[PDB]
Amino acid sequence: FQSMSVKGRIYSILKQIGSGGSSKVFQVLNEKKQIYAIKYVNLEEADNQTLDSYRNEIAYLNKLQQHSDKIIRLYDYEITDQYIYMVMECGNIDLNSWLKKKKSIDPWERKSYWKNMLEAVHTIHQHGIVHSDLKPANFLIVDGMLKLIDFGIANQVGTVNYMPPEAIKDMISPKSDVWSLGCILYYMTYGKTPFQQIINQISKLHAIIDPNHEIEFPDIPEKDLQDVLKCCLKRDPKQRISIPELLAHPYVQIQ
Numbered sequence: 001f002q003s004m005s006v007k008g009r010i011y012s013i014l015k016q017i018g019s020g021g022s023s024k025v026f027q028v029l030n031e032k033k034q035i036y037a038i039k040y041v042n043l044e045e046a047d048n049q050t051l052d053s054y055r056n057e058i059a060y061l062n063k064l065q066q067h068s069d070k071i072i073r074l075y076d077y078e079i080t081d082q083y084i085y086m087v088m089e090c091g092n093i094d095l096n097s098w099l100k101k102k103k104s105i106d107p108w109e110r111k112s113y114w115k116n117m118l119e120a121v122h123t124i125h126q127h128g129i130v131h132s133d134l135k136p137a138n139f140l141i142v143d144g145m146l147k148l149i150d151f152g153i154a155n156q157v158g159t160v161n162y163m164p165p166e167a168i169k170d171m172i173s174p175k176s177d178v179w180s181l182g183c184i185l186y187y188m189t190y191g192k193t194p195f196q197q198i199i200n201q202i203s204k205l206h207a208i209i210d211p212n213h214e215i216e217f218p219d220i221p222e223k224d225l226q227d228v229l230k231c232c233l234k235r236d237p238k239q240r241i242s243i244p245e246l247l248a249h250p251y252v253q254i255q
């Protein structure tokens with residue numbers, strides 16, 4: 001059994017949840033036997049722009065948690081020249097792992113999750129943040145609630161199935177996140193992303209930008225859900241619905 005120290009407080013490591021870019025996420029217990037998630041970041045090989053991207057995301061995370069409970073909690077952190085330790089909220093599972101494990105999703109569960117994703121993404125937009133790389137792995141289930149875990153600021157790896165056509169053309173506005181959220185809801189509706197069937201990545205990238213390539217929206221009992229999907233997956237950002245409009249949509253309002 002291994003331990004860690006964060007700002008004088010001792011944490012015993014239970015297990016490693018994940019491992020990213022020079023990073024590890026651990027499930028830990030504090031002195032009062034409370035469960036937390038500790039994100040460890042190794043700063044050994046990080047350059048000044050990478051460091052500035054890390055500091056900037058921490059500051060936004062720290063500031064934005066007061067504005068919405070749909071943003072993961074950041075309780076404390078320890079930052080040196082060698083590492084970052086972030087004491088965070090521990091969730092049950094990320095949305096990507098949950099969706100991959102589940103056969104059929106409940107329409108009520110789908111709707112509450114969609115409301116949470118809208119509230120979290122709306123919060124970051126109000127602060128001038130466009131995520132631009134939204135995917136289900138950016139969301140965490142904490143007591144039947146979805147929380148955004150990151151803001152896309154700091155430097156499902158390289159997935160293209162949630163990419164807006166304008167991100168492919170450029171290589172970004174708040175509308176880019178609407179397309180990505182639309183793809184997540186489409187996955188929660190039909191069990192696949194709109195272009196998932198296209199295995200070849202270049203042929204898939206061409207389909208996402210092609211106006212002639214029609215996205216299929218098969219008939220479902222929830223007509224409002226079908227409408228949200230069609231409104232989100234408009235290839236022209238100017239013709240795409242906004243987050244404030246999605247928040248007043250019958251799909252999230254009509255009980």
Ligand SMILES: COc1cc(OC2CCN(C)CC2)ccc1Nc1ncc2c(n1)n(C1CCCC1)c(=O)n2C
Nearest residue numbers: 017018025027037039088089090091092093094097149
């Ligand atoms: C119970 O602990 C979990 C288990 C879990 O299940 C994963 C399913 C797939 N396997 C391969 C790994 C565990 C996902 C998230 C969590 N909780 C959690 N709670 C808090 C987390 C956090 N994850 N993550 C990453 C998201 C993906 C991996 C780590 C974080 O960055 N924080 C702050």
